[PDB]
Amino acid sequence: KKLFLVFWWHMHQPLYREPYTGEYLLPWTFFHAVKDYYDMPAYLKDFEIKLNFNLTPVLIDQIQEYAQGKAKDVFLEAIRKDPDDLEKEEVEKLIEFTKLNYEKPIYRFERIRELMNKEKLNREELLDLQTLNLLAWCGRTLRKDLKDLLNKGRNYTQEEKEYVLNKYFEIIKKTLSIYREIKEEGKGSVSTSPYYHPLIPILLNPNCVYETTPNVKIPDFAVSFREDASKHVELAKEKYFEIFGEHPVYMWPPEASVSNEALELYYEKGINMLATDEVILKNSVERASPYLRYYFRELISVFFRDKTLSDLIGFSYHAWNAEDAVRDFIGRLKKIHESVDFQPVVFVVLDGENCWEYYEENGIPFLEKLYSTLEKEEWIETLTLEEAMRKEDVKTEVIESVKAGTWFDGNFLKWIGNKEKNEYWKILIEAKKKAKNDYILVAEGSDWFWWQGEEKAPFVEVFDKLFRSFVRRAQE
């Protein structure tokens, strides 16, 4: 009797490319590309387990633009320049970026502490600040390759910075290829999401928020977004086909968000399986285990993620010693294994790139220990999404209705409901009446609403500039 374990790492960035200038106004796609988007599937070269990935199409577009050398990334320009060529504003942006990231474990360089405690920085000090900002985001692969430059910790030259930059772009250029490789070799399945990561249930029916939060205030949705909901899914199928040569049959619904209408749309668009959150299951069925494969109306397969296990990795284990965390995770799997006489399917689904910066050494000790341990546990079998979809020796249940929600509290309050978020929806509703191109789809991304107030929102003014620029561009 096995326990089936299914990792599904979700990779996404909203579009940071300002549509009038073409400038990438934040570097987060670059930094997560060099730190996480190649390195997470690259573990499959070293560990004989299965790991699955979601790539949003908008993320794929940006990875391609960086790989082609076309991304005009303003922060990265300030890193690349000789410090004698830095504008005053670029020095300020470099220091502010450092300050925002200063307390993260991946920024724990003695030299960063020295530089941030100095009233003025000279050219050699600025070179160190530029190069250490780059190296703080070094991924697993290059942390071995560049180990000697990493252990320097200071006294970097322009030549060394450019060498690091060159290696980083090498990583980006081979990133889509590694997803094709691990997919073709059967080491993982790759899914995608509706194109710009929108909240499909709200686009289909804004009143679905009242299935969970009767007291929420929403704006007057005086225009239909239902056709846009279909377009996000259709365009995503085509982008996926461009990369992989096939239409996707698995999708990750953004924010785990489902509704009866959203599930019908995914079925109509040929999606065979998705996953969502355990809280949705609890809200929808009186008594139901997340270790079964579910069939929504016999139309589409649904797995409900194990929220506890997923949140332990995504939010808890950065605060743990790595060996202890792996022992805790395996011991929880052992308890699940011993708790049922059938073979449970355990979905661990979470963002694939956001938790690691808070772990010791970027989560590399934790993941290496976790994966090394898993590959040797005879009673655990990790599965691709395809294997999980088709596994016969598993328990199964038909479900007829879900209560609309997300993986954040089972409801939509992170994206709608307060004055500031509602103002964004009002702006979008009015723009949609006048919309002339697909930039309206960009503005439907969940990210813009996530950050709109909110007191914890790094660079929130940039997200606001982007959202409003996409809204304006959509009407021209």
Ligand X SMILES: OC[C@H]1O[C@H](O[C@H]2[C@H](O)[C@@H](O)[C@@H](O[C@H]3[C@H](O)[C@@H](O)[C@@H](O)O[C@@H]3CO)O[C@@H]2CO)[C@H](O)[C@@H](O)[C@@H]1O
Chain residues that interact with ligand X, rule: CB under 6 A: 10, 12-14, 28, 32, 351, 353-354, 446-447, 450, 458-459
Contacts with 18 (C-beta within 8 Å, 6 or more apart), sequence order: 24, 25, 465, 466, 469
**Considering beta carbons, is residue 13 or 191 the nearer one to ligand X?**
13
Q: Comparing C-alpha atoms, which of 434, 429, 423 is closest to residue 473?
A: 434
Q: Toward ligand X, which CB reaches closer, 170 or 351?
A: 351
- Rank residues 15 and 345 by Cβ distance to ligand X and give the closer one: 15
| Residue nearest ligand X by beta-carbon distance | 447
Q: Over the range 248-260, which residues count as b (16 or more CB within 10 Å of their CB) and which as e?
A: bbbbbbbbbbbbb
Q: Is 248 helix (H, G, I), strand (E, B) or coil?
A: coil
For 121, the 3-state DSSP assignment is coil
Shortest CB 362 distance to ligand X, Å: 13
Element (H, E) at 201: helix 200-204
Sequence-separated (6 or more) residues with CB below 8 Å from residue 317: 325, 328, 329, 359, 366
Q: How far is the CB of 167 from ligand X (least distance, A)?
A: 21
| Residue placing its CB nearer to ligand X in the complex, 32 or 293 | 32
Identity of residue 139: G
Supply 292's token pair.
């079964």
CB of 60 to ligand X, least distance (A): 14
Of 188, 195, 309, 290, residue with least CA distance to 241: 195
Evaluate the omega torsion of the peptide bond into residue 454 and state whether it is cis, within 30 degrees of 0.
Answer: yes
Q: Which is nearer to ligand X, 55 or 326 (CB)?
A: 55
Beta strands in 12-81 (DSSP E): 23-24, 52-55, 72-73
**Letter for the amino acid at 476?**
E
Residue 353 C-beta: closest distance to ligand X, Å? 5
Q: CB 29 → ligand X: shortest distance, Å?
A: 8
- Smallest gap from Cβ 27 to ligand X, in A, equals 9
- Is the Cβ of residue 12 or residue 403 nearer to ligand X in the bound state? 12
Nearer to ligand X, 32 or 421 (CB): 32
With a CB cutoff of 8 Å and minimum separation 6, the contacts of 406 are 199, 255, 256, 257, 277, 412, 414, 415
DSSP-derived secondary structure letter, 2:
P
Q: Which residues contact 349 (CB under 8 A, 6 or more apart)?
A: 7, 8, 10, 252, 256, 275, 305, 310
Q: How far is the CB of 373 from ligand X (least distance, A)?
A: 26
Structure tokens at 361: 């050494």
- Do 80 and 35 form a contact (C-beta atoms < 8 A)? no
| Cβ count within 10 A of residue 41 | 25
Q: Residue 149 or 353: which CB sits closer to ligand X?
A: 353
Read off the tokens for 61: 């577009």
Q: Which is nearer to ligand X, 306 or 399 (CB)?
A: 306
SS (H, E, C) 221-247: CCCCCHHHHHHHHHHHHHHHHHHHCCC
Residue that has been written with the tokens 């969502």 in this structure: 276
Nearer to ligand X, 186 or 458 (CB): 458
Considering the complex, state which of residue 30 and residue 291 has its C-beta at the smaller distance from ligand X. 30
What is the closest distance, in whole angstroms, from the C-beta atom of residue 405 to ligand X in the complex? 14
Q: Report, in Å, the least distance between residue 137 CB and ligand X.
A: 10
| Tokens (6 digits) for 295 | 């069939």
10 vs 318, beta carbon nearer ligand X: 10
Q: What is the largest CA-CA distance in the chain?
A: 68
CA dist 252 and 193 (Å) reads 5
Distance CA 107, CA 338 (A): 41
